[PDB]
Enzyme design. Structure first.
Site, short mmCIF file in Angstrom:
data_model
loop_
_atom_site.label_atom_id
_atom_site.label_comp_id
_atom_site.label_asym_id
_atom_site.label_seq_id
_atom_site.Cartn_x
_atom_site.Cartn_y
_atom_site.Cartn_z
CG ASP A 16 -0.52 -0.14 2.53
OD1 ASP A 16 0.61 -0.01 2.94
OD2 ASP A 16 -1.32 0.02 3.66
NE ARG A 30 -1.58 3.30 4.14
CZ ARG A 30 -2.50 2.52 3.95
NH1 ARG A 30 -3.09 2.52 2.57
NH2 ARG A 30 -3.04 1.87 4.95
CG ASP A 35 -6.12 -0.53 6.22
OD1 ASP A 35 -5.27 0.37 6.23
OD2 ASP A 35 -7.27 -0.44 7.01
CB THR A 36 -2.02 -4.32 1.70
OG1 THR A 36 -0.94 -3.58 2.05
CG2 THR A 36 -2.83 -3.56 0.48
CD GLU A 38 1.29 -2.43 7.64
OE1 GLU A 38 2.59 -2.61 8.46
OE2 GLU A 38 0.33 -1.91 7.99
NE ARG A 82 2.30 7.12 4.98
CZ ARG A 82 2.06 6.20 5.80
NH1 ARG A 82 2.83 5.01 5.80
NH2 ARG A 82 1.02 6.12 6.29
#
Length: 136
Positions: A16, A30, A35-36, A38, A82
């Site tokens: 992500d 970002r 949400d991936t 991690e 970001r």
């Protein structure tokens, strides 16, 4: 209206997060609304499907002729500096592809940065129905 602006991939960092050259500046982006799992995760390290999510984003963006960034209508950077955006690889939204493949969940959404929330939610429902990856 949201509009796309071009960008140049510097390095894919995680499922992500990417480093891009944007208007002559190297910057970390970002992916908005997803949400991936991690690989560079604060406490658990490599979560399941983390490596896969990461390989997918990397391949998608590395193999693209054109990469574009799309800012939403809210804040454009987060507290870590970001960029917050929708990323397109040859016209295809990376954020949605990850969700459609079951390699990401739709994130907690923050108004007003929620323009493609329904689209993504619809892809998430589908991946779940297909029991793909995270949903299997």
């Amino acid at each position: 209206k949201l509009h796309k602006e071009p960008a140049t991939l510097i390095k894919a960092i995680d499922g992500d997060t990417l480093k891009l050259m944007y208007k002559g500046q190297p910057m970390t982006f970002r992916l908005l609304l997803v949400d991936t799992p991690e690989t560079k995760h604060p406490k658990k390290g490599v979560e399941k499907y983390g490596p896969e999510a990461s390989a997918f984003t990397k391949k998608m963006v590395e193999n693209a002729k054109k990469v574009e960034v799309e800012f939403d209508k809210g804040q454009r950077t987060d507290k870590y500096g970001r960029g917050l955006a929708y990323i397109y690889a040859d016209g295809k939204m990376v954020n949605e592809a990850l969700v459609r493949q079951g390699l990401a969940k739709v994130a907690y959404v923050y108004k007003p940065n929620n323009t493609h929330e329904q689209h993504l939610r619809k892809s998430e429902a589908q991946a779940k129905k297909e029991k793909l990856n995270i949903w299997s």
